[PDB]
């Protein structure tokens, strides 16, 4: 699993 | 700005 | 699991 | 301004 999140 | 990332 | 929240 | 982030 590779995963990523942003709130900008 | 909030970020995060994983493996795995 | 990867989660993120902003209030602003 | 309130932010939060997690794994996992």
Swiss-Prot record, chains A, B, C, D:
Site (Susceptible to oxidation): 1
Marked site positions, Cleavage: 6-7
Taxonomic superkingdom: Eukaryota
Protein name from the UniProt record: P3(42)
Species of the source: Homo sapiens
Residues of the full protein shown: 706 to 713 of 770
């Amino acid at each position: 699993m590779v995963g990523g999140v942003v709130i900008a």
